[PDB]
Amino acid sequence: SMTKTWTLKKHFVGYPTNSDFELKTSELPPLKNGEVLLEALFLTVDPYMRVAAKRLKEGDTMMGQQVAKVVESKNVALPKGTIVLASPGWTTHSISDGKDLEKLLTEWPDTIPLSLALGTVGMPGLTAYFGLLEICGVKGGETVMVNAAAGAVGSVVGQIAKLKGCKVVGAVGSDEKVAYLQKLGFDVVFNYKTVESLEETLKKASPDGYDCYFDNVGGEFSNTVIGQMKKFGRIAICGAISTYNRTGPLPPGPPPEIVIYQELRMEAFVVYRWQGDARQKALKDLLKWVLEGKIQYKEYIIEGFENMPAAFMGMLKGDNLGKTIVKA
Amino acid sequence: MTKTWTLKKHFVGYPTNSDFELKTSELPPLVLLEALFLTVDPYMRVAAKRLKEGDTMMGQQVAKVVEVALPKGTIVLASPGWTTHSISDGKDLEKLLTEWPDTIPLSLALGTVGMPGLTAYFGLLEICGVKGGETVMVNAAAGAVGSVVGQIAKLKGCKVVGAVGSDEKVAYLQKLGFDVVFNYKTVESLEETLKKASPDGYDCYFDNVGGEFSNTVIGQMKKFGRIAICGAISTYNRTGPLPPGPPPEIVIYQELRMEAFVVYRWQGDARQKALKDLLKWVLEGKIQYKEYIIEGFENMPAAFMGMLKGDNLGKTIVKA
Ligand SMILES: [Cl-]
Ligand SMILES: [Cl-]
Ligand SMILES: [Cl-]
């Protein structure tokens, strides 16, 4: 057997470039009893990988999740053809003993793409689900500010908020994303790169301020939003993508006087905090909302394992509309 | 007649004497309140920016009536600003605790058994949510709030690491029983000092200072660590832009919870019970108090500036 794997040739300086990755071919050992050989069907690239890569040794495999098919099996629980979620990194083939896999929902229908298990009905959707419903604690009727609102996480945040009865103000990085989310029904959507002044745009979008802030971006953008949070406003700190590729010092922080006077609550979280029955129920809620049309999905499918570095870099620069997925 | 301190000129950096102006005024006929003790507090540096030039500096005081619910001689807490005399209709006053003993200074109603002590109580017990066994980082630890925070933490069963601005404050807090105390102005490296003070990190952070100091503390917070954002004094008297924010990757990876608060959020039975607790702990010796008494209403600006620069040990109080 053989496998193709993407490794970190060099730690990223600023945004990644092609020279930071190295494609290597490896010979897999044969199966031992209780193991299976997994062939990747869909592999995800996600913003967190820019940060997690700093913990790698140079030469290590890039981390990441994938939907995979069993092609050979010495384990009866996983017959040839079983579909699983695995995280062996950017690799076409891998060997697993079975304890590091997750079977898809038993109720998974064939009317929606399998790749949604890496998106709206997978890790990004769960991040939106718990970030908004638990960390932000929306009950209905709130005004919610979400940035990267067309990304894998933000798009789910806005649509869950809408089905809960919230007003949604979304910030995105391109006109095409603005038009898409406006057609979905978000109350206000704008391109942060082209606004004449961010402060006036946010003020007009909600004169009374914002109850909740789902933050994927960080940086100066968040300083402006903090200046328009209502008293006791809740901020879910999910990501800081505007800073991940920074080469210089971080931008100034928010004005402390505003944070204190408004008594803001700001909590950071990672989706893996929730496991067991909480995680499983969130997945079923996301599945039902998708099947009812309450949550639309959009994917940017890229063909070819060899193009995975390009998919990752394009995703970081915001060039793709929809969850970026690499189809092997 | 009455004496009043006004904001002659908005502060640039730390205040100076020329930024204040003492004015004499004639009070109208009617209760008349004469100030015995007036407090100066860090929050005034920030609140002063909202003032118009010529306005009275804001502040609280203990006062006694000099001229029916308020007979001549009643002691009250009032906030007419930096003024020796003021007129009140009675609805903006608070009678002291009915059980207030005469064995402790009246001026403690502006301190450990007053607004600063309540800030420590709710910031640590509710916002930080200490239950016992936590390692708590507190800065400005010898100030009115911080000193109460550390002593409440100790009586709750916490380890306390305190940062102060002078060697005299280090010795005082060590005598109070803080596990670790250091002078941030003279430490070779804040990161190394905090790391040895608690190799395992910090469960809670009572933050009165902000700025780069807090960025370093955030890098040593444990997972699910709780931060109570009480003040940002290092940024109050600042020239130039605010310092960079904390590293987002650390905040997210450690899933930190950071909530800001102001003491006035709690009223009614919560506030009364907190006052009752603070007084009881003082009478039991679990919370020691210390005051820096400055004689003369004319010296109130000097008391405020010295307090901001960390020159005063104990709650800064101006006795008229
Ligand atoms: Cl976006
Ligand atoms: Cl994506
Ligand atoms: Cl101090």
mmCIF file of all heavy atoms in Angstrom, chain B residues 127-147:
data_model
loop_
_atom_site.group_PDB
_atom_site.id
_atom_site.type_symbol
_atom_site.label_atom_id
_atom_site.label_comp_id
_atom_site.label_asym_id
_atom_site.label_seq_id
_atom_site.Cartn_x
_atom_site.Cartn_y
_atom_site.Cartn_z
ATOM 1 N N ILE B 127 -17.813 37.477 40.379
ATOM 2 C CA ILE B 127 -17.278 37.496 39.021
ATOM 3 C C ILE B 127 -16.202 36.427 38.859
ATOM 4 O O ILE B 127 -16.207 35.658 37.890
ATOM 5 C CB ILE B 127 -16.744 38.898 38.676
ATOM 6 C CG1 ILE B 127 -17.838 39.947 38.904
ATOM 7 C CG2 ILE B 127 -16.248 38.934 37.236
ATOM 8 C CD1 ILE B 127 -19.063 39.777 38.031
ATOM 9 N N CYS B 128 -15.250 36.376 39.795
ATOM 10 C CA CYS B 128 -14.269 35.299 39.784
ATOM 11 C C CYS B 128 -14.868 33.994 40.292
ATOM 12 O O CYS B 128 -14.453 32.918 39.854
ATOM 13 C CB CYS B 128 -13.043 35.681 40.613
ATOM 14 S SG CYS B 128 -11.928 36.915 39.854
ATOM 15 N N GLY B 129 -15.832 34.059 41.203
ATOM 16 C CA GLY B 129 -16.480 32.850 41.679
ATOM 17 C C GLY B 129 -15.585 31.905 42.454
ATOM 18 O O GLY B 129 -15.688 30.683 42.286
ATOM 19 N N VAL B 130 -14.727 32.435 43.325
ATOM 20 C CA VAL B 130 -13.811 31.579 44.063
ATOM 21 C C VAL B 130 -14.599 30.700 45.027
ATOM 22 O O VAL B 130 -15.552 31.150 45.676
ATOM 23 C CB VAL B 130 -12.764 32.417 44.816
ATOM 24 C CG1 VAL B 130 -12.114 33.423 43.880
ATOM 25 C CG2 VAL B 130 -13.380 33.110 46.025
ATOM 26 N N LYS B 131 -14.232 29.424 45.080
ATOM 27 C CA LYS B 131 -14.809 28.475 46.016
ATOM 28 C C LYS B 131 -13.796 27.954 47.023
ATOM 29 O O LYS B 131 -14.193 27.280 47.982
ATOM 30 C CB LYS B 131 -15.434 27.288 45.259
ATOM 31 C CG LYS B 131 -16.543 27.691 44.292
ATOM 32 C CD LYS B 131 -17.752 28.234 45.047
ATOM 33 C CE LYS B 131 -18.889 28.612 44.110
ATOM 34 N NZ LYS B 131 -20.053 29.172 44.858
ATOM 35 N N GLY B 132 -12.515 28.246 46.836
ATOM 36 C CA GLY B 132 -11.489 27.716 47.686
ATOM 37 C C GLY B 132 -10.499 26.860 46.934
ATOM 38 O O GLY B 132 -10.907 26.014 46.130
ATOM 39 N N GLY B 133 -9.207 27.061 47.197
ATOM 40 C CA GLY B 133 -8.152 26.313 46.553
ATOM 41 C C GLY B 133 -7.572 26.942 45.301
ATOM 42 O O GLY B 133 -6.572 26.428 44.777
ATOM 43 N N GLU B 134 -8.155 28.031 44.809
ATOM 44 C CA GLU B 134 -7.648 28.676 43.611
ATOM 45 C C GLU B 134 -6.380 29.472 43.909
ATOM 46 O O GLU B 134 -6.134 29.921 45.035
ATOM 47 C CB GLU B 134 -8.696 29.623 43.016
ATOM 48 C CG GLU B 134 -9.945 28.948 42.498
ATOM 49 C CD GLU B 134 -11.071 28.966 43.522
ATOM 50 O OE1 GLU B 134 -10.811 29.282 44.703
ATOM 51 O OE2 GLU B 134 -12.223 28.667 43.151
ATOM 52 N N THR B 135 -5.589 29.681 42.859
ATOM 53 C CA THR B 135 -4.478 30.621 42.880
ATOM 54 C C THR B 135 -4.945 31.890 42.187
ATOM 55 O O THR B 135 -5.326 31.850 41.012
ATOM 56 C CB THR B 135 -3.252 30.030 42.186
ATOM 57 O OG1 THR B 135 -2.926 28.785 42.814
ATOM 58 C CG2 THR B 135 -2.074 30.989 42.272
ATOM 59 N N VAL B 136 -4.926 33.002 42.915
ATOM 60 C CA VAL B 136 -5.522 34.255 42.473
ATOM 61 C C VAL B 136 -4.405 35.268 42.280
ATOM 62 O O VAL B 136 -3.577 35.465 43.175
ATOM 63 C CB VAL B 136 -6.560 34.772 43.486
ATOM 64 C CG1 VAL B 136 -7.205 36.061 42.984
ATOM 65 C CG2 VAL B 136 -7.613 33.696 43.767
ATOM 66 N N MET B 137 -4.386 35.919 41.121
ATOM 67 C CA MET B 137 -3.475 37.027 40.856
ATOM 68 C C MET B 137 -4.253 38.323 41.035
ATOM 69 O O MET B 137 -5.344 38.475 40.479
ATOM 70 C CB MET B 137 -2.887 36.928 39.444
ATOM 71 C CG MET B 137 -1.552 37.661 39.275
ATOM 72 S SD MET B 137 -1.741 39.455 39.204
ATOM 73 C CE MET B 137 -0.277 39.967 40.115
ATOM 74 N N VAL B 138 -3.727 39.235 41.845
ATOM 75 C CA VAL B 138 -4.341 40.545 42.034
ATOM 76 C C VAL B 138 -3.252 41.600 41.912
ATOM 77 O O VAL B 138 -2.182 41.463 42.513
ATOM 78 C CB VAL B 138 -5.068 40.645 43.389
ATOM 79 C CG1 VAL B 138 -4.144 40.273 44.523
ATOM 80 C CG2 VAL B 138 -5.642 42.042 43.601
ATOM 81 N N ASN B 139 -3.501 42.626 41.104
ATOM 82 C CA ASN B 139 -2.583 43.748 40.956
ATOM 83 C C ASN B 139 -3.173 44.980 41.635
ATOM 84 O O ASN B 139 -4.342 45.005 42.029
ATOM 85 C CB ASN B 139 -2.278 44.005 39.477
ATOM 86 C CG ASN B 139 -3.523 44.093 38.639
ATOM 87 O OD1 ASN B 139 -4.586 44.456 39.139
ATOM 88 N ND2 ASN B 139 -3.407 43.754 37.360
ATOM 89 N N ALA B 140 -2.347 46.014 41.781
ATOM 90 C CA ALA B 140 -2.671 47.109 42.700
ATOM 91 C C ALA B 140 -3.111 46.526 44.041
ATOM 92 O O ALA B 140 -4.094 46.965 44.644
ATOM 93 C CB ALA B 140 -3.745 48.028 42.119
ATOM 94 N N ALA B 141 -2.388 45.493 44.490
ATOM 95 C CA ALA B 141 -2.859 44.652 45.582
ATOM 96 C C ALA B 141 -2.854 45.360 46.926
ATOM 97 O O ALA B 141 -3.497 44.871 47.865
ATOM 98 C CB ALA B 141 -2.006 43.380 45.668
ATOM 99 N N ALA B 142 -2.165 46.494 47.042
ATOM 100 C CA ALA B 142 -2.170 47.271 48.272
ATOM 101 C C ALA B 142 -3.159 48.421 48.232
ATOM 102 O O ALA B 142 -3.287 49.134 49.224
ATOM 103 C CB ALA B 142 -0.766 47.810 48.580
ATOM 104 N N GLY B 143 -3.882 48.598 47.126
ATOM 105 C CA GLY B 143 -4.874 49.646 47.040
ATOM 106 C C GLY B 143 -6.144 49.282 47.782
ATOM 107 O O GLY B 143 -6.292 48.189 48.328
ATOM 108 N N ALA B 144 -7.091 50.223 47.774
ATOM 109 C CA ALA B 144 -8.316 50.046 48.551
ATOM 110 C C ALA B 144 -9.045 48.764 48.165
ATOM 111 O O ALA B 144 -9.530 48.026 49.032
ATOM 112 C CB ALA B 144 -9.238 51.251 48.356
ATOM 113 N N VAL B 145 -9.126 48.478 46.871
ATOM 114 C CA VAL B 145 -9.815 47.281 46.420
ATOM 115 C C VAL B 145 -8.907 46.065 46.553
ATOM 116 O O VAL B 145 -9.288 45.054 47.156
ATOM 117 C CB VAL B 145 -10.304 47.464 44.969
ATOM 118 C CG1 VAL B 145 -10.908 46.155 44.448
ATOM 119 C CG2 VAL B 145 -11.307 48.621 44.868
ATOM 120 N N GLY B 146 -7.688 46.158 46.018
ATOM 121 C CA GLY B 146 -6.830 44.986 45.942
ATOM 122 C C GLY B 146 -6.503 44.394 47.297
ATOM 123 O O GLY B 146 -6.450 43.172 47.454
ATOM 124 N N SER B 147 -6.270 45.249 48.295
ATOM 125 C CA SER B 147 -5.942 44.753 49.627
ATOM 126 C C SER B 147 -7.096 43.947 50.214
ATOM 127 O O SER B 147 -6.877 42.955 50.924
ATOM 128 C CB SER B 147 -5.579 45.921 50.543
ATOM 129 O OG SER B 147 -6.685 46.779 50.739
#
